[PDB]
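Budget justification note: compute hours in this period were largely spent on complex prediction jobs such as the one shown. Inputs:
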Amino acid sequence: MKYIQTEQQIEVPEGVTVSIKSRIVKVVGPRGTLTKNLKHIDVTFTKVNNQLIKVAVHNGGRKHVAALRTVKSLVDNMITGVTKGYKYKMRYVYAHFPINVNIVEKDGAKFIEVRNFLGDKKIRNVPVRDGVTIEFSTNVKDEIVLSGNSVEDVSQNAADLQQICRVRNKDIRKFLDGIYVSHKGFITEDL
Amino acid sequence: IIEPSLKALASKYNCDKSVCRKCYARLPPRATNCRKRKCGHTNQLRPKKKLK
Amino acid sequence: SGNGAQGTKFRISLGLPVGAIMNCADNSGARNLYIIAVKGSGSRLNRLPAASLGDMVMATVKKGKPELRKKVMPAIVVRQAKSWRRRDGVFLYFEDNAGVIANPKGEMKGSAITGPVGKECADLWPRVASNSGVVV
RNA sequence: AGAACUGGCGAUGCGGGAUGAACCGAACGUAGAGUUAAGGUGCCGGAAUACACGCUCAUCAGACACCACAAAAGGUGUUAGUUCAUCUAGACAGCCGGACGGUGGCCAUGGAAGUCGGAAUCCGCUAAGGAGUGUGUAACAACUCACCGGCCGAAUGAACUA
RNA sequence: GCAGUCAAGCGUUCAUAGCGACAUUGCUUUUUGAUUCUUCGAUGUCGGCUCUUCCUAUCAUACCGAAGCAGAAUUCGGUAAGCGUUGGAUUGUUCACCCACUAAUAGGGAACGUGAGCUGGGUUUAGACCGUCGUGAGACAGGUUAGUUUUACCCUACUGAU
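Corresponding output:
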């Protein structure tokens, strides 16, 4: 039916700055700069004033509106990413075999090294995606915690480490050994 | 030795799922249709069996 | 090769096509054995399964005490009589084929192994070292 | 394989159906000029990538008869409707709590009063909240749960028909 | 032959792990038939040896998901044909049941692939025996033995050479 035109509202706290030219979206904040290209998705941005910036689609269909919405949620997740920050608390899970996680510099590319997984003789390794520093939590035994900027950084690298721990052709409902993303936090202690 | 704080969370990533009858596709719990385009998006489901 | 035999057997020439009659090396009472099929050989169109030194080959019995006849049994060939080559360059070969009745795991239905024995089939079945005669 | 009323083909060309005797239009002396049928109007082909309103994206699209394949069943894929329902005295979500009590009406009686249960149901305080649902343990004290509903501020849910 | 739809039941409890009747919609040509449209001025007709290629409704392997999957072994399914699918006794055998090795010993065609490639055991002529039928001449998927299998120097396709 082509709903004529709709809009959504993006809102900016004091110390963060969006910059949108063409459809390229720059963000600058306390957590540094983020950049993203939305040009595939075809939307129009309206800036009234700073804290109020409205996105709109005219003469589009169901799917196209459905795209406008997730454009909102995207860019806004970047903004609240550059104020708060993104932190994932993952806790180790092991039964008879404790899992070793080293951080290793190899050609300066930051590889996470996993050893003694299921007592296996294989070495496991994952590249760390860009921007996310990794900590090991204090006074929580067997925890690893990820810290970074955009949701795709932290989320993607985290989940990748999650799925490096799959068990091969054993029972998946009996052996529970692995590493699991549990709590999804924001870097700043308060929020 | 596992303990629920280390265990019951794993059910959410293993043992809490739904499965399509035709394509055996793993699905989140409340999903009302299989996503796969090969199976025909059929709604039929079964809860993934718990231990014993 | 096969399941139950430890050790890495280096390859040797193929001296015993199916039907070949080895002579028995011990108390079994069979004047001679008869091959049928071989453990571990490959399949190729109109190719008889090869047999050779150190092989574990199935066998039947054409001579001697009855209780040996009319039942398939594992057996091992300890003398090839076809010249093969160790990696060290020699070509050594015996003057007749030979074989020993044995269990799947390397134990001997026999006692002592008459005549000389090629060591490639000795050290490959570490059990047979103690039941062995003159080796090499 | 066998018949009936026509028409064709054999005994018949031409244009169209890419091609094919029986399909469509048309029945030819030879030339000229003109206008049309069927079919087409991206390019191969001459002719409008002309106009209009729409609908569909398919990690095995569809493409126009005879002509050369497809079904039964499914799909909040999508679009359009029908009938029920529900409604800014405030919906549906998703958070924040609470659900009081007469009386454990009455009954299994060893005790569960809503709930190892029942042949089966009225009253009091609420702009609310049930002799009444799991945690609970033979029971009991706590809330789960329609709801006052604070936040939320609007239509949504179900069945289908296509 | 294969593939679905629904589901009473079996499956400990339990339609749906796996089964799957009751019915029920399809696909395939690989059998066997029906038709006989084309060839009796002859397309040489079974199987085996040989030799590539192709389709998957994949037997094994790569990668996974379910399981009435603890591990092991095994079952059901998906992306896939890339490679691999045997050695022997008896049979003219297609087929088959057999012993063993096996990662596994899947299914099929390509004019029942390929006779100027072979063999020609079979079937199909002429000889011969027996059983039954026939009064006789004779007849029989009967059962058995014996039985000339031609030419390439043509074009093309290919493999090599200028």
